[PDB]
Design a protein around this ligand. Structure first.
Ligand SMILES: C#C[C@]1(O)CC[C@H]2[C@@H]3CCc4cc(O)ccc4[C@H]3CC[C@@]21C
Ligand SMILES: C#C[C@]1(O)CC[C@H]2[C@@H]3CCc4cc(O)ccc4[C@H]3CC[C@@]21C
Ligand SMILES: ClC1=C(Cl)[C@]2(Cl)[C@@H]3[C@@H](Cl)[C@H](Cl)[C@@H](Cl)[C@@H]3[C@@]1(Cl)C2(Cl)Cl
Ligand SMILES: ClC1=C(Cl)[C@]2(Cl)[C@@H]3[C@@H](Cl)[C@H](Cl)[C@@H](Cl)[C@@H]3[C@@]1(Cl)C2(Cl)Cl
Lengths: 279, 279
């Protein structure tokens, strides 16, 4: 069974999720939409490869029942590969705010020194974003269902299996297949958030002990509520997914910074979280 | 055969069409797009009936290869029925300018007094718009193909036959089925433009004689270039379509003014041409 402290812990995390996760994306508005040198040469080639590796179309369902649909352009060696970047920057920025709010509502987080709060959020914001995004992911239709917005994966030559070579996409399908509870998602967010080895963390003995407690609570939760053979080793699978998410976080940070280098687009909040300084 | 004067006449009309018809709609830009009392009660009911009687979705093909698609809302008793009005006002305004330019390039038109020019354009602008729109109408797919913009008729319960109850739509299908030449379309535009019985025309003996000459030139053109049994009575069918277009013009003017009464949207050029004064 769960100890009282373990029940309190889950309770406070679920409370924080409830207050700060706009699951219908109702308050996401005023966002942008797509319009209607050998060293440099190597930079663009890489960014081009990075960008086309994850193509989505976009749908907007109006409250009135109207539907707008956007199919992205092909790469034709020009700036059209950047068409969805302002929009995506706005969406991630919106998600990041929710995630910052999530963190601030948690007592264990508030109690850390401010410099560590910042270091942990800089370290985990993206990961907590992916974790929240997975809960609105539809693995049957390859679509992230964000209230009135949908982001639908473009077909490719190898269909599912091939698009699934992309680590971000493999991560989303694999996590969704685990069929996690809300409680388990939010404990994943805590474990990722309270990671002792993020750049700049000072109170890392504290953070490490906090992390260990969230992990023990998760292991205990699974043991108390999931007896089926399907869920044998579920706790270890989740921890393995969390390690993988940190790898993905590192890869995508590098992509971001590679795009940013040749085509600036990061919002001010994005710059803050990813260490772009404005100069 | 055609007399020299008849060849000159067609030549000058075709010249005017060539210079003033943006057939790829390349210069149509900066247009608006849909966003992302018992006496009054009777007004809205009528306007609602008027508006839903011709529903189109809209597609925009970007030069980069991107595609935007808009599916209109259902009537739910609110202002959503007006969603495409600003856009359509911008498109018609764009077409009207081309049509005004067309008229001004024609010697027979320039030679009329200015007050008659204005009276003829007020009378015929809409009709010449429909005539030009028919040349980019695709009767197989029920779409008006305006370069990178397409306007596609929405499906309904009776399919083609039922949507074809709408006089505007019946007119477009019937005219397209006649498979007219460019020359014949532009002579239709001249006959409509030079109509002696538009409100306010003063030199109507002149205009009537001008109109009669364009009609004789058209009859002669058909007789010289169309011997097939399919085209027997083609000249009379065209004149019957022109009479029908004037009926449509009267109906649609009333719809326009009915919408305008309860929901103003007409551009300044629209107001000028339809006699809305600004007060
Ligand atoms: C390059 C590249 C990509 O693989 C396709 C689009 C890129 C994202 C664009 C938006 C965005 C926003 C962030 O806050 C952080 C990263 C990104 C980019 C990550 C790499 C992506 C998915
Ligand atoms: C009401 C109604 C309708 O049948 C559907 C949309 C209406 C048009 C909107 C744009 C427009 C522009 C013009 O310059 C003149 C008329 C109109 C309206 C005509 C009636 C329409 C087709
Ligand atoms: Cl997830 C995910 C979503 Cl969602 C989109 Cl729209 C975008 C957000 Cl804005 C950032 Cl946070 C992340 Cl890296 C990406 C991806 Cl992989 C896509 Cl391109 Cl699908
Ligand atoms: Cl034709 C024709 C076209 Cl085109 C559209 Cl988009 C619109 C123009 Cl802007 C005005 Cl001029 C005319 Cl009345 C209408 C219709 Cl019937 C539709 Cl709603 Cl299809």
């Amino acid at each position: 069974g769960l100890t009282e402290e373990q029940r309190m812990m889950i309770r406070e995390l679920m409370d924080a999720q409830m207050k700060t996760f706009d699951t219908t994306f109702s308050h996401f508005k005023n966002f942008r939409l797509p319009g209607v040198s050998r060293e440099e040469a190597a930079k663009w080639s890489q960014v081009r490869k990075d960008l086309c590796s994850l193509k989505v179309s976009l749908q907007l369902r109006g409250e009135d029942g109207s539907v707008w649909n956007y199919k992205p352009p092909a790469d034709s060696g020009g700036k059209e590969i950047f068409s969805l970047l302002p929009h995506m920057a706005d969406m991630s920025t919106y998600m990041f705010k929710g995630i910052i709010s999530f963190a601030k509502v948690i007592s264990y987080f508030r109690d850390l020194p401010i410099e560590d709060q910042i270091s942990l959020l800089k370290g985990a914001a993206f990961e907590l974003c992916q974790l929240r995004f997975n809960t609105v992911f539809n693995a049957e239709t390859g679509t992230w269902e964000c209230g009135r917005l949908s982001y639908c994966l473009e077909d490719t030559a190898g269909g599912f299996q091939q698009l699934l070579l992309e680590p971000m996409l493999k991560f989303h399908y694999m996590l969704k297949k685990l069929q996690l509870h809300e409680e388990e998602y939010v404990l994943m967010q805590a474990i990722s958030l309270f990671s002792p080895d993020r750049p700049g963390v000072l109170q890392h003995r504290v953070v490490d002990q906090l992390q260990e407690q969230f992990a023990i609570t998760l292991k205990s939760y699974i043991e108390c509520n999931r007896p089926q053979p399907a869920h044998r080793f579920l706790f270890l699978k989740i921890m393995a997914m969390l390690t993988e998410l940190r790898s993905i976080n590192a890869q995508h940070t590098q992509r971001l910074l590679r795009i940013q280098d040749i085509h600036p687009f990061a919002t001010p909040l994005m710059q803050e979280l990813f260490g772009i300084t404005g100069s």
